[PDB]
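Exercise 7. Predict the structure of ribonuclease A from Bos taurus.
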Amino acid sequence: KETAAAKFERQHMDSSTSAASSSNYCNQMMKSRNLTKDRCKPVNTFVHESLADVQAVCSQKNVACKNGQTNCYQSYSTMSITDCRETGSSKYPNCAYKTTQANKHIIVACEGNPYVPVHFDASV
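Solution. The predicted structure, encoded as tokens:
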């Protein structure tokens, strides 16, 4: 199995690099993280901050989740993130992505005991 928390780390945490290393980044990462195993996941965001920093967002600004739930939190500071988005040549099993770096606030849904990030909601 894999807990919601471990799953979030797998799909969204990349503390090794401070930014989107290169145009090749998303292609390597989406595959490496097993995000292109059952289909090409259309979009995915990686956060280049420490695990502790991202978990701390659960005690930050409480905001509404896109699905209407109220367990979402927005970071007070901007964080380094990389957006991975499908290219047109993208054809399963040959998934292709466009790597895009930016500094934005992240919004994550948190749950459990301890209270940790379980889902990436949005970035603003």
